[PDB]
Design an enzyme around this catalytic site. Structure first.
Site, PDB file in Angstrom:
ATOM      1  N   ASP A  34      35.950  20.172  23.112  1.00 22.38           N
ATOM      2  CA  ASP A  34      36.730  19.039  23.620  1.00 22.38           C
ATOM      3  C   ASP A  34      38.182  19.089  23.160  1.00 22.38           C
ATOM      4  O   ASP A  34      38.492  18.699  22.030  1.00 22.38           O
ATOM      5  CB  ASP A  34      36.071  17.730  23.140  1.00 22.38           C
ATOM      6  CG  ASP A  34      36.796  16.489  23.620  1.00 22.38           C
ATOM      7  OD1 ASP A  34      37.727  16.639  24.448  1.00 22.38           O
ATOM      8  OD2 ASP A  34      36.429  15.360  23.164  1.00 22.38           O
TER       9      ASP A  34
ATOM     10  N   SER B  13      53.364  18.192  34.295  1.00 22.83           N
ATOM     11  CA  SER B  13      53.246  18.922  35.551  1.00 22.83           C
ATOM     12  C   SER B  13      54.470  18.679  36.410  1.00 22.83           C
ATOM     13  O   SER B  13      55.064  17.609  36.361  1.00 22.83           O
ATOM     14  CB  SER B  13      51.991  18.465  36.295  1.00 22.83           C
ATOM     15  OG  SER B  13      51.923  19.028  37.593  1.00 22.83           O
TER      16      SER B  13
HETATM   17  C1  LIG Z   1      28.508  10.697  28.608  1.00 21.62           C
HETATM   18  N1  LIG Z   1      29.054  10.030  27.401  1.00 21.62           N
HETATM   19  C2  LIG Z   1      28.745  10.752  26.150  1.00 21.62           C
HETATM   20  C3  LIG Z   1      29.485  12.041  26.115  1.00 21.62           C
HETATM   21  C4  LIG Z   1      29.163  13.307  26.420  1.00 21.62           C
HETATM   22  C5  LIG Z   1      30.293  14.103  26.122  1.00 21.62           C
HETATM   23  C6  LIG Z   1      31.256  13.257  25.641  1.00 21.62           C
HETATM   24  O1  LIG Z   1      32.500  13.430  25.106  1.00 21.62           O
HETATM   25  C7  LIG Z   1      33.625  12.961  25.799  1.00 21.62           C
HETATM   26  C8  LIG Z   1      33.500  12.108  26.886  1.00 21.62           C
HETATM   27  C9  LIG Z   1      34.654  11.706  27.537  1.00 21.62           C
HETATM   28  C10 LIG Z   1      35.872  12.173  27.083  1.00 21.62           C
HETATM   29  N2  LIG Z   1      36.002  12.994  26.035  1.00 21.62           N
HETATM   30  C11 LIG Z   1      34.885  13.375  25.407  1.00 21.62           C
HETATM   31  O2  LIG Z   1      30.782  11.989  25.639  1.00 21.62           O
END
Ligand SMILES: CNCc1ccc(Oc2cccnc2)o1
Length: 330
Positions: free
Chosen positions: A35, A199
């Protein structure tokens, strides 16, 4: 040193991507969501409330000879989709694709929110934004990339996400066989802790390119592409029957439609997102209304170049003293 790991979509829609990560001694392999929009490495664990675990692989620090409790440290995080988790912290050895960091902060979940429990394929997150966003208290901790950086051949990592297919995260080198043409680099601001860039504009389908500055973040942890309402309205106006639905929570379109492409600018270069990348399928099983992959950022407070955009490119996260981002077609 370098590392190289395959990243795999969790489902048929590319809702997220998971990458295997080795933690502890002997190794415990967990599949983590890499992430670039957050900065915590956290995992489902033997400490996670039992009723909140449903199919995930857990980290058990008591079975790792290299695990050490980081005394007094706790963490708590919320994400843009409404989800959250929290717990305590160990340090342990963490390896990704052959690249090893010793003494990495591994944040062990005591609590996770419902949407984490409900996704059996994600065993935790590995944050790759700037360490200034890390939530560990009272002593903030470094990301895997920051801990690795000095040892890397080059202080970079790259994201090569696949459309309905596996892709690759590389650490410490640029694979010149993985993209076409040249990589265009663009300035980054780290003031908000993100890989934030500007961008140079957009086009819809075969339409003319609109030169306009769009400030946003390169975020592998967000599924969709979130852009200003003006831009998003211009896109969906080209799809017969498309409309914003307050009850569904965004733009939907007839599943019978063929979607136009969307182009975004990176300096004088252009990255084209094929129409098919923008189709996220029926809003509910059996529905003929489909959810769009380009949505308004109004209300979020920031534009987000999520997976829908990034998977159309080979993306370089350059962590030199002055960070930059690079984009190439592929
Ligand atoms: C679906 N919600 C739980 C979940 C899975 C992965 C992540 O992590 C995220 C979600 C949105 C933005 N950034 C990271 O959250």
């Amino acid at each position: 040193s370098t590392g190289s790991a395959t990243t795999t979509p969790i489902d048929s829609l590319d809702d997220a991507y998971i990458t295997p990560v080795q933690i502890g001694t002997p190794a415990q392999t967990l599949n983590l969501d890499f992430d670039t929009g957050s900065s915590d490495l956290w995992v489902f664990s033997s400490e996670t409330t039992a009723s909140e675990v449903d199919g995930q692989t857990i980290y058990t620090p008591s079975k790792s000879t290299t695990a050490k409790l980081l005394s007094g440290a706790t963490w708590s995080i919320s994400y843009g989709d409404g989800s959250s988790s929290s717990g305590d912290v160990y340090t342990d050895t963490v390896s990704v694709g052959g690249l090893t960091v010793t003494g990495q902060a591994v944040e062990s979940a005591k609590k996770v929110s419902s949407s984490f429990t409900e996704d059996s394929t994600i065993d935790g997150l590995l944050g790759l934004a700037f360490s200034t966003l890390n939530t560990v208290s009272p002593t903030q901790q470094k990301t895997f990339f920051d801990n690795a950086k000095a040892s890397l051949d080059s202080p970079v990592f790259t994201a090569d996400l696949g459309y309905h297919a596996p892709g690759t995260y590389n650490f410490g080198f640029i694979d010149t066989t993985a993209y076409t043409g040249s990589i265009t680099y663009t300035a980054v601001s780290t003031k908000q802790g993100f890989w934030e860039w500007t961008s140079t504009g957009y086009a819809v389908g075969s339409g003319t390119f609109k030169s306009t500055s769009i400030d946003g973040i390169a975020d592998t942890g967000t599924t969709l592409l979130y852009l200003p309402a003006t831009v998003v309205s211009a896109y969906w106006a080209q799809v017969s029957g498309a409309k914003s639905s307050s009850s569904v929570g965004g733009y939907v379109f007839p599943c019978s439609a063929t979607l136009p492409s969307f182009t975004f600018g990176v300096g004088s270069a252009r990255i084209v997102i094929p129409g098919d990348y923008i189709d996220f399928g029926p809003i509910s099983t059996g529905s003929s209304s489909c959810f769009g992959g380009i949505q308004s950022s109004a209300g979020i407070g920031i534009n987000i170049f999520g997976d829908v955009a990034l998977k159309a490119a080979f993306v370089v996260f350059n962590g030199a003293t002055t960070p930059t981002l690079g984009f190439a077609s592929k």
